[PDB]
Design a protein around this ligand. Structure first.
Ligand SMILES: O=C(O)Cc1cc(I)c(Oc2ccc(O)c(I)c2)c(I)c1
Ligand SMILES: [As]
Ligand SMILES: [As]
Ligand SMILES: [As]
Ligand SMILES: [As]
Ligand SMILES: [As]
Ligand code: NA
Length: 255
């Protein structure tokens, strides 16, 4: 189980998901697939943003406007993902907003990075709007745009499926280091159940890529970095752009 994990590996075998883990895996996957804008066919049904909005330095009002106008639906799908996870529900109100505010940008940026399109060198926001590096940058994200784009390009080789993306989200969600958490121990035990099932799913997947698990975990910290760096970007925006231009849900998640 969680203990018999050493010998098994120490002899050279890689345990695949136990039956209990297979259920957790299906729960997390369904939760993700059901709340991910579009699905399978997300890329023929997407519109590029006119090459003039991104103004191809103050934040470009037009881009910021187009981006903030569709941010509420994005945040909402993240809360929805969390709600479909039994472990999340087993936590106190106080802790739940904490976890959500903490992983929101981490998960959202993962969802747009995983949909990087190398042909047109674009990322797609909310499954509809496809933007370029500069557009997203000038829209208000600054270097965050570069971070997500670089993550996206690197992720191409990982060939992640819905389950792997879902498990990543689950690991980001259950972060017991968020300041102000009450149930630090319980939340850490949950992230452990996810990481254990995740690693096992990876052994079952058999990616023809060396040290997949470790490299994959490094992406975790990058997403955490993208989030922390976005919070700063948020302060840079609250000092230029006016409040009226900040969707109420967008304001409560990041401040
Ligand atoms: O793709 C999805 O599911 C969700 C998603 C939606 C958007 I709009 C988005 O861009 C942001 C995010 C924060 C921010 O302050 C600004 I300005 C723009 C990203 I990155 C991801
Ligand atoms: As609930
Ligand atoms: As509360
Ligand atoms: As608790
Ligand atoms: As950064
Ligand atoms: As920053
Ligand atoms: Na650049």
């Amino acid at each position: 189980a969680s203990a018999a994990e050493e010998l098994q590996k120490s002899i050279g075998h890689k345990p695949e998901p136990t039956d209990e883990e297979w259920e957790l895996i299906k729960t997390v996957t369904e939760a993700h697939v059901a709340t991910n804008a579009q699905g399978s066919h997300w890329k023929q049904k997407r519109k590029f943003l006119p090459e003039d909005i991104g103004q191809a330095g103050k934040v470009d009002l037009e881009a910021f406007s187009h981006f903030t106008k569709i941010i509420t639906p994005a945040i909402t799908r993240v809360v929805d993902f969390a709600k479909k996870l039994p472990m999340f529900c087993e936590l106190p109100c106080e802790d739940q907003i904490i976890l959500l505010k903490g992983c929101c940008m981490e998960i959202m940026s993962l969802r747009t990075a995983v949909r990087y399109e190398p042909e047109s060198e674009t990322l797609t926001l909310n499954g509809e709007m496809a933007v370029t590096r500069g557009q997203l940058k000038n829209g208000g994200l600054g270097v965050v745009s570069d971070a997500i784009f670089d993550l996206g390009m690197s992720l191409s080789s990982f060939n992640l499926d819905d389950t792997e993306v879902a498990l990543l989200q689950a690991v980001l969600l259950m972060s017991s280091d968020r300041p102000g958490l009450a149930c630090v121990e319980r939340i850490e035990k949950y992230q452990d159940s996810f990481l254990l099932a995740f690693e096992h799913y990876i052994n079952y997947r058999k990616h023809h890529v060396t040290h997949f698990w470790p490299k994959l975990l490094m992406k975790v910290t990058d997403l955490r970095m993208i989030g922390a760096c976005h919070a700063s970007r948020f302060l840079h925006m609250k000092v230029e752009c006016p409040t009226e231009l900040f969707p109420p849900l967008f304001l409560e998640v990041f401040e």
